[PDB]
């Protein structure tokens, strides 16, 4: 189906010690493939996936030099945004930035994202048609005017449509063994009597990629949107994902309940019933 | 591949 490439940059100011801490990561779908940490001794852009190590020295040198330029821009942004909001020098503040692109089934351009945030709330974003900006508060209007007077949305649009998609197809073909795979969830369900009368039925979902899965609980066709608990999807540490959903029922009515799991790797959605 | 253009500040 679709695919995506995303880049996340975060910068935190330390008003008493050293330069601000900067961390940058890059994702293809749900696989992290590159990192950069300013506190690390290497001071280089480092790989995180087996298929990204084929790149030459010029690639790593360029990536390092440009992400360091990103960090300097974020430092100056912190300095200015402290001025716009009239805050003291002794606080600690954070700027966050995200940009990336999506491609469809035929590996054509579909959409692109560019967003800023200051202290966890939206500051300025690039609209879904990639032509005009969106600013939330009054302090962002000055930045909007400054960027709208220098055609910044089109320097970014030129990158988001062309070179992001070029790079994404490059990676998708370099790592076809792992990036285009798909794993079926290993589904099983367990029972636990609570004290004497009620019981918990919990249907699991283990070791599936990608991370998009859906779990539902039904009682003879009744959609149980309530009385059920499902936890956030959690990584397993090896590139797979786990989940589970549980429901409490009176004893003797276990056969009345069932769990449906649908994943992209399942040709037909499953249905689990006790024993 | 990070964005290869001209850096613009807030």
């Amino acid at each position: 189906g679709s695919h995506s490439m995303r880049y996340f940059f975060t910068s935190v100011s330390r008003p008493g010690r050293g330069e601000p801490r900067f961390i940058a990561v890059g994702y293809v779908d749900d696989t992290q493939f590159v990192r950069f940490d300013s506190d690390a001794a290497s001071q280089r852009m480092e790989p995180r996936a087996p298929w990204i190590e084929q790149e030459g020295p010029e690639y790593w040198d360029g990536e390092t030099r440009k992400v360091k330029a990103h960090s300097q821009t974020h430092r100056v942004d912190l300095g200015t945004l402290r001025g716009y909001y009239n805050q003291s020098e002794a606080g600690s503040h954070t700027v966050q930035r995200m940009y990336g692109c999506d491609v469809g089934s035929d590996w054509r351009f579909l959409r692109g994202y560019h967003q800023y945030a200051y202290d966890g709330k939206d500051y300025i974003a690039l609209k879904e048609d990639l032509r005009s900006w969106t600013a939330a508060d009054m302090a962002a209007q000055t930045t909007k005017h400054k960027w709208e007077a220098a055609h910044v949305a089109e320097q970014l649009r030129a990158y988001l449509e062309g070179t992001c998609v070029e790079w994404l197809r490059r990676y998708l073909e370099n790592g076809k063994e792992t990036l285009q795979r798909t794993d079926a969830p290993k589904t099983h369900m367990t029972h636990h009597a609570v004290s004497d009368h009620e019981a918990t039925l919990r249907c699991w979902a283990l070791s599936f990629y990608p991370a998009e899965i859906t779990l539902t609980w039904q009682r003879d066709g009744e959609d149980q949107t309530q009385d059920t608990e499902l936890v956030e999807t959690r990584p397993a540490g090896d590139g797979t994902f786990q989940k589970w959903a549980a429901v409490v029922v009176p004893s003797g009515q276990e056969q009345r309940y069932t769990c449906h799991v649908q994943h992209e790797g399942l040709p037909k959605p499953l249905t689990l019933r006790w024993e | 591949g990070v964005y290869d253009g001209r850096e613009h500040t807030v």
């Epitope: 030459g56 020295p57 010029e58 690639y59 040198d61 360029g62 030099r65 440009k66 055609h151 089109e154 320097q155 649009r157 030129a158 990158y159 062309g162 070179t163 070029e166 790079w167 197809r169 490059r170 | 591949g1 290869d4 253009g5 001209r6």
Partner: antibody, heavy 112, light 114 residues
């Protein structure tokens, strides 16, 4: 691969208004650059048009970009707007290690 | 601003010529060396990227012209065995980041006589 700039030579009267244009066909266009060159010096950078649709404007020159071609409008030329006007295009590449494509030029001569 | 040096060269046929392309106002990532014979259009000679080895063109004959991208702000073209057919107008351009425009410095008139 295909960037043709016409007319190959121009001749204007001081105070007229003319327009050059540069036609290109690529699967690409990371950018489009307009330069100007004197007979015995290095080219002088004039414009960059990253996407199709927008239009820049310097003191007297004006540039536009569309899906098929780009135009350079000159309004009320003076006899010192005499040079060679060059058009370049940078096609897309994952790494940008692909050389530009240069138009041949256009000799502009302004008579008083 | 990109500036070359020297701006005028004359030499006996048989010696080597060295031209420099100091880049100012930024740290250039890519440096291009062009060439222009009189009354004809620009022809690209070679390209040097980051700190790797230069990539030459079809009619440039590597053993003649040498490029040494030593620093991030200094390229150095060297014509090894000058010949009177190598009397042309050499220009050099530089760009930072693969997405921005390049800048040209002032050319360099070379004339070789035997």
């Amino acid at each position: 691969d295909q960037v043709t700039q016409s007319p190959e030579a121009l001749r204007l009267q001081e105070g007229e208004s003319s327009s050059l244009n540069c036609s290109y066909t690529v699967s690409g266009l990371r950018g489009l650059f307009w330069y100007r060159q004197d007979p015995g010096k290095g080219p002088e950078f004039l414009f960059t048009l990253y996407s199709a649709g927008e239009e820049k404007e310097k003191e007297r020159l004006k540039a536009t970009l569309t899906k098929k071609e780009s135009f350079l409008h000159i309004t009320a030329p003076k006899p010192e707007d005499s040079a060679t006007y060059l058009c370049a295009v940078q096609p897309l590449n994952a790494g940008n290690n692909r050389k530009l494509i240069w138009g041949l030029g256009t000799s502009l001569a302004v008579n008083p | 601003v990109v500036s070359q040096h020297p701006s005028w060269v004359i030499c006996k046929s048989g010696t080597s010529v060295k031209i420099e392309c100091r880049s100012l106002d930024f740290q250039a990532t890519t440096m291009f060396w062009y060439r222009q014979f009189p009354k004809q259009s620009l022809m690209l000679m070679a390209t040097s990227n980051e700190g790797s080895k230069a990539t030459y063109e079809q009619g440039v004959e590597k053993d003649k012209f040498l490029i040494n991208h030593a620093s991030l702000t200094l390229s150095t073209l060297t014509v090894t065995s000058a010949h009177p057919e190598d009397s042309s107008f050499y220009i050099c351009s530089a760009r930072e980041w693969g997405g921005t425009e390049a800048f040209f410095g002032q050319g360099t008139r070379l004339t070789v006589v035997e």
